[PDB]
Write a protein that binds this ligand. Structure first.
Ligand SMILES: *[C@@H]1O[C@H](CO)[C@@H](O[C@@H]2O[C@H](CO)[C@@H](O[C@@H]3O[C@H](CO[C@H]4O[C@H](CO)[C@@H](O)[C@H](O)[C@@H]4O)[C@@H](O)[C@H](O[C@H]4O[C@H](CO)[C@@H](O)[C@H](O)[C@@H]4O[C@H]4O[C@H](CO)[C@@H](O)[C@H](O)[C@@H]4O)[C@@H]3O)[C@H](O)[C@H]2NC(C)=O)[C@H](O)[C@H]1NC(C)=O
Ligand SMILES: *[C@@H]1O[C@H](CO)[C@@H](O[C@@H]2O[C@H](CO)[C@@H](O[C@@H]3O[C@H](CO[C@H]4O[C@H](CO)[C@@H](O)[C@H](O)[C@@H]4O)[C@@H](O)[C@H](O[C@H]4O[C@H](CO)[C@@H](O)[C@H](O)[C@@H]4O)[C@@H]3O)[C@H](O)[C@H]2NC(C)=O)[C@H](O)[C@H]1NC(C)=O
Ligand SMILES: *[C@@H]1O[C@H](CO)[C@@H](O[C@@H]2O[C@H](CO)[C@@H](O[C@@H]3O[C@H](CO[C@H]4O[C@H](CO)[C@@H](O)[C@H](O)[C@@H]4O)[C@@H](O)[C@H](O[C@H]4O[C@H](CO)[C@@H](O)[C@H](O)[C@@H]4O)[C@@H]3O)[C@H](O)[C@H]2NC(C)=O)[C@H](O)[C@H]1NC(C)=O
Ligand SMILES: *[C@@H]1O[C@H](CO)[C@@H](O[C@@H]2O[C@H](CO)[C@@H](O)[C@H](O)[C@H]2NC(C)=O)[C@H](O)[C@H]1NC(C)=O
Ligand SMILES: *[C@@H]1O[C@H](CO)[C@@H](O)[C@H](O)[C@H]1NC(C)=O
Ligand SMILES: *[C@@H]1O[C@H](CO)[C@@H](O)[C@H](O)[C@H]1NC(C)=O
Ligand SMILES: *[C@@H]1O[C@H](CO)[C@@H](O)[C@H](O)[C@H]1NC(C)=O
Ligand SMILES: *[C@@H]1O[C@H](CO)[C@@H](O)[C@H](O)[C@H]1NC(C)=O
Ligand SMILES: *[C@@H]1O[C@H](CO)[C@@H](O)[C@H](O)[C@H]1NC(C)=O
Ligand SMILES: *[C@@H]1O[C@H](CO)[C@@H](O)[C@H](O)[C@H]1NC(C)=O
Ligand SMILES: *[C@@H]1O[C@H](CO)[C@@H](O)[C@H](O)[C@H]1NC(C)=O
Ligand SMILES: *[C@@H]1O[C@H](CO)[C@@H](O)[C@H](O)[C@H]1NC(C)=O
Ligand SMILES: *[C@@H]1O[C@H](CO)[C@@H](O)[C@H](O)[C@H]1NC(C)=O
Ligand SMILES: *[C@@H]1O[C@H](CO)[C@@H](O)[C@H](O)[C@H]1NC(C)=O
Ligand SMILES: *[C@@H]1O[C@H](CO)[C@@H](O)[C@H](O)[C@H]1NC(C)=O
Ligand SMILES: *[C@@H]1O[C@H](CO)[C@@H](O)[C@H](O)[C@H]1NC(C)=O
Ligand SMILES: *[C@@H]1O[C@H](CO)[C@@H](O)[C@H](O)[C@H]1NC(C)=O
Ligand SMILES: *[C@@H]1O[C@H](CO)[C@@H](O)[C@H](O)[C@H]1NC(C)=O
Ligand SMILES: *[C@@H]1O[C@H](CO)[C@@H](O)[C@H](O)[C@H]1NC(C)=O
Ligand SMILES: *[C@@H]1O[C@H](CO)[C@@H](O)[C@H](O)[C@H]1NC(C)=O
Lengths: 449, 126, 126, 126
């Protein structure tokens, strides 16, 4: 009748914790080679037949806003960027005075140049005679000084040129947990991403999450189920970003109608800088198309979900960014190696009450970037030959709400971003790390003599 | 039936006691960025030998299950035999006993195999 | 006679069963370029504890040899007692049984010490 | 009385045989400059599993103490029962037997559990 303790080894007992996650990225991506593209070099090949065990009767609480996988992925991509830029050519002797001029074209005065044809000195292979070579830089890359210009990053940090061998192509990366840990996955169709989850399953490795670094518009993401999803840490708080996840992807097409040439000027011995030669064809600016009908149905489907949290009979007005850096006021992204910054004033210019072509957006191109708000490392994106065309999916948004309302029933939303961790939170909301404690004692009528 | 690793997580302790050999099997599993997994599998084997050391100094050694000569104190959540194995999950049980786990561990490593084995040394010489 | 490490590899299984304590003895053996051997002896001890864990969760624990209550299924290459120990090498045998090793492992870790020890738990209380 | 870790180092072997469970308990204990302790505690667990492997392949397994069917060779410092446990320390004894430790180890791992367990396999089939 008197019970006795008995040690059980191998009980389904886990507790929330944080550990060191490793990678996984299939086996066909390793065949992409090209001198180690992005990260996949010594990454473990993904298991051909992954197993996902649905834990019946199990209800586990998730928290996408207090999840450590986001911070780990962020620091991992940062260290990746540094390790990818450590052995590349450093452009230390490139801050020389630039005697720039307009590009060869024919007016008007509203074209504001944008492209500057700079002539300057350069150190050759030998440490004696210099080199009077010219390049073609964007206005966002240069800045005049008292026409003589200079690189915009002179009195900020150093600069290193990205090697032409590697690529900035986001490839699916599976994050896996070591022995003794497990990743819980919420498999409900309406998980707005916080609190208890009815249908929880366990996995060793997550699905292929492509590290697409972008702002305002979530590109190449996971589609939502049924209705579009709206996630926020504090809806009443207008300082917390609002991650929107789409159900139907919005087809976007971005092009660079300036098929360019790569001049291989030689800053020897060894090093070589890739300048931009003359432009073959017409002087055109990069642009992005968004299908008017798709954008209408997507916006009309989102505002119907927005009315479920800010009152049924309210007015939702869309306005573009309030201001700041170029990475926040414009849709910043990467395509073909070039870094576009597109005008998103034609997408967020609407006013919804309670009840056939394409929208083109002006896109600028910058070569000298300082992403992740990093000071000390400026990367020069080498020019890319040929017309660059890319087709992507708009699968979500990062919105911000205006404050100090009180009066009035309308609510105004503007594109935001900045913190790149939000880009990872849009994919890690359905995963969390737990540690296994298989040692459990329990009483029963068992002993020895 | 084989629910798999952590299969019987939502089942009762009596039902989850049948899946002991499943969570025990997948518990060990056999330039920078490569040391990321090294330091992790080192902490993995240190966690394994830590649990094996606790399992050894107690009156078990043989894994999975083992009995002990310790009376269950009613203050440690006075529940019944049929209310534990047929009405409570292991997570729910560990949530209540989290206060007394270290106390029981102390009553298991010190009071038992330190007094029991010395008793056997006194019983084996004659 | 002591043929040494891997001595009776070409000998019959019955003859090679005498050299068990030889391959088991040399199985554990007690700035860059120095981590080359570190990560190797770490995988060496992980492979050792992996085999020791499988040898422990089964009805063995005591190494070298142990018996089990599992009927030999004829589908696993139906051979005779004298046709295995006196007419086949361990490499040739493992080449045939490679399909069913994981199945037997499942019938050893789960069907035995999970039902046998619980049976003893019922037999040791009276 | 509990002298602590390495307490009975200067006491006789018979007296120091009472403190076996003390030196065995504290034998495992649960950017550069941080790998200094990592490689050390890895060699610590490799030294522990090394001694556990020797203690397992012999006729012991159960730690602390175990008896064996090996005749004490008079050439290994022919001393008396009362002249060893009541007149010699473990350091002084190991200083004399250092020549024959490896020989005895060979007579323990090979001659015993390789011939004894096979004998039991012959005794357990009938
Ligand atoms: C969201 O996800 C989508 C889906 O993948 C992704 O779209 C991808 O866009 C990128 C552009 O940013 C694409 O990658 C490039 O595609 C062009 C054009 O592809 C043609 O060529 C292949 C050849 O078989 C055809 O099959 C194909 O159908 C097209 O006709 C390629 O030309 C590019 O190749 C060069 O660039 C790579 C990176 O710079 C190099 O690694 C690669 O080795 C190639 O370099 C060599 O060739 C160059 C050619 O001139 C040469 O100049 C170089 O010096 C070098 O020698 C590149 O592969 C991709 O095609 C799109 N995906 C799909 C399915 O089509 C989005 O980019 C993504 N969103 C975000 C934000 O990342
Ligand atoms: C960016 O800015 C740089 C300058 O900093 C440019 O590079 C220069 O571009 C100009 C074109 O505007 C080049 O000028 C051309 O040079 C040619 C070289 O010919 C050499 O050999 C002949 C003998 O065969 C010599 O007579 C001559 O002096 C040279 O030594 C000339 O042949 C060209 O002449 C042709 O075009 C002109 C155009 O008006 C006609 O009038 C002529 O009749 C003839 O058809 C021309 O003079 C200059 O050489 C380039 N310099 C360097 C260092 O490359 C880029 O053009 C500019 N890019 C943009 C987009 O603005
Ligand atoms: C974007 O801008 C780039 C700038 O580099 C343009 O690239 C050049 O394009 C032209 C035109 O297509 C290419 O010129 C072609 O050269 C071919 C021969 O090249 C080989 O042989 C020479 C020696 O003779 C070598 O030096 C060279 O390396 C090659 O091995 C010709 O055969 C071509 O003529 C044929 O094609 C054209 C259409 O292209 C037909 O009209 C002709 O009738 C004929 O059938 C042609 O003259 C040049 O080689 C390209 N350079 C590079 C580096 O690629 C892109 O064309 C431009 N794209 C767009 C869309 O604007
Ligand atoms: C992006 O470009 C693709 C390719 O041109 C467009 O898809 C085409 O759409 C038209 C109109 O429906 C069809 O007739 C073509 O057959 C489609 N082609 C392909 C390859 O799909 C797409 O509409 C463009 N989207 C935007 C927003 O510009
Ligand atoms: C181009 O030329 C015009 C006319 O001299 C001048 O005013 C202007 O500053 C130049 N540069 C740009 C970028 O327009
Ligand atoms: C460098 O710039 C100077 C401007 O003072 C100019 O005189 C010279 O021609 C340029 N190029 C070379 C190769 O010196
Ligand atoms: C957008 O769609 C909504 C809802 O169907 C609508 O009232 C409106 O007329 C559409 N706008 C355009 C420009 O078609
Ligand atoms: C928003 O669009 C307006 C056009 O009405 C433009 O003047 C403004 O600069 C834009 N602001 C941002 C931050 O894009
Ligand atoms: C974006 O487009 C709007 C509308 O054409 C324009 O008023 C605004 O100045 C543009 N923003 C930038 C930064 O060019
Ligand atoms: C926004 O849309 C309204 C209505 O079509 C239009 O009057 C206004 O000019 C637009 N703003 C911009 C910057 O295009
Ligand atoms: C992007 O959307 C298009 C349009 O339906 C689809 O064909 C493509 O598979 C999508 N890409 C994804 C989901 O990665
Ligand atoms: C049992 O628990 C009670 C109440 O907490 C306490 O008074 C008593 O000391 C405990 N006894 C043991 C052996 O733990
Ligand atoms: C059942 O619970 C009661 C009340 O706490 C207690 O008196 C009794 O000892 C318990 N019996 C068993 C078998 O646990
Ligand atoms: C744990 O102990 C604390 C402090 O005595 C107490 O507040 C709490 O109720 C206890 N919880 C459980 C589950 O025993
Ligand atoms: C033995 O194998 C045969 C044929 O493959 C099959 O019918 C039978 O179920 C198997 N039994 C066991 C216990 O493996
Ligand atoms: C030999 O194998 C056959 C076929 O499985 C069987 O009938 C027979 O009993 C076996 N004999 C011995 C001696 O093992
Ligand atoms: C292994 O299994 C496969 C698949 O059934 C079969 O083709 C092969 O004959 C088997 N080999 C042995 C040695 O049993
Ligand atoms: C005992 O010692 C003697 C002399 O040192 C030696 O001849 C003999 O081999 C030893 N016995 C064993 C079992 O090694
Ligand atoms: C005692 O020591 C002597 C001298 O070495 C020896 O002859 C005798 O065998 C020893 N006896 C015992 C019981 O050890
Ligand atoms: C150890 O062996 C050597 C070599 O035979 C010998 O000189 C020495 O006396 C031996 N020492 C002991 C303590 O047996």
């Amino acid at each position: 009748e008197n019970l006795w303790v008995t040690v059980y080894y191998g009980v389904p007992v886990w507790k929330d914790a944080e550990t060191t996650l490793f990678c996984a990225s299939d086996a066909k991506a390793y065949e992409t080679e090209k001198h180690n593209v992005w990260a996949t070099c010594a990454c473990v090949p993904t298991d051909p037949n992954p197993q996902e065990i649905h834990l019946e009767n199990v209800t586990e609480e998730f928290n996408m806003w207090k999840n450590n996988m986001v911070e780990q992925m962020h620091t991992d991509i940062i260290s990746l960027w540094d390790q990818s830029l450590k052995p590349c050519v450093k452009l230390t002797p490139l801050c020389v005075t630039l005697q720039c001029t307009n590009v060869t074209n024919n007016i008007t005065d509203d074209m504001r140049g944008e492209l500057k044809n700079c002539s300057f000195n350069m150190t050759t292979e030998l440490r004696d005679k210099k080199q009077k070579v010219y390049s073609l830089f964007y206005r966002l890359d240069v800045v005049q000084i008292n026409k003589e210009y200079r690189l915009i990053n002179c009195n900020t940090s150093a600069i290193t040129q990205a090697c032409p061998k590697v690529s900035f192509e986001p490839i699916p990366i599976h994050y896996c947990a070591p022995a003794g840990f497990a990743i819980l996955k919420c498999k409900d169709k309406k998980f707005n991403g916080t609190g208890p989850c009815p249908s929880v399953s366990t996995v060793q490795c997550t699905h292929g999450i492509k590290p697409v670094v972008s702002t305002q518009l979530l590109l190449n993401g996971s589609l939502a189920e049924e209705e579009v999803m709206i996630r926020s840490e504090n809806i009443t708080n207008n300082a917390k970003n609002i991650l929107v996840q789409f159900n139907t992807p919005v087809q976007i097409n971005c092009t660079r109608p300036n098929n360019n040439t790569r001049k291989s000027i030689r800053i020897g011995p060894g090093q070589a800088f890739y300048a931009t030669g003359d432009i073959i064809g017409d002087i055109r600016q990069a642009h992005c198309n968004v299908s008017k009908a798709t954008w209408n149905e997507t916006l009309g489907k989102v505002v119907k979900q927005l009315r479920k949290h800010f009152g049924n009979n309210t007015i939702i007005r869309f306005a573009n960014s309030s201001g700041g850096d170029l990475e926040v006021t414009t849709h910043s992204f990467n395509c073909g190696g070039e870094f576009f910054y597109c005008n998103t004033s034609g997408l967020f210019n609407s006013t919804w009450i309670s009840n056939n072509d394409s929208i083109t957006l002006p896109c600028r191109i910058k070569q000298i970037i300082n992403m992740w708000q990093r000071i000390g490392q400026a990367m020069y994106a080498p020019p890319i030959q040929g017309v660059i065309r890319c087709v992507s999916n708009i699968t979500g948004l990062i919105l911000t709400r205006d404050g100090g309302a009180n009066n009035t029933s309308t609510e105004t939303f503007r594109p935001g971003g900045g913190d790149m961790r939000d880009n990872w939170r849009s994919e890690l909301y359905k995963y969390k790390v737990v540690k296994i404690e298989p040692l459990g004692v329990a009483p029963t009528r068992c002993k020895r003599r | 039936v084989f629910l798999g690793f952590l299969g019987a997580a939502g089942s009762t302790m009596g039902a989850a006691s049948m899946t002991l050999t499943v969570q025990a099997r997948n518990l060990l599993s056999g330039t920078v960025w490569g040391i990321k997994q090294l330091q992790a599998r080192v902490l993995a084997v240190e966690r394994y030998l830590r649990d094996q050391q606790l399992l050894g100094i107690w009156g078990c050694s043989g894994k999975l299950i083992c009995c002990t000569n310790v009376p269950w104190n009613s203050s440690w959540s006075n529940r019944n035999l049929s209310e534990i194995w047929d009405n409570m999950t292991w997570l729910q049980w560990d949530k209540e006993i989290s206060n007394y786990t270290q106390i029981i561990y102390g009553l298991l490593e010190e009071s038992q195999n330190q007094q029991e084995k010395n008793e056997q040394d006194l019983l084996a010489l004659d």
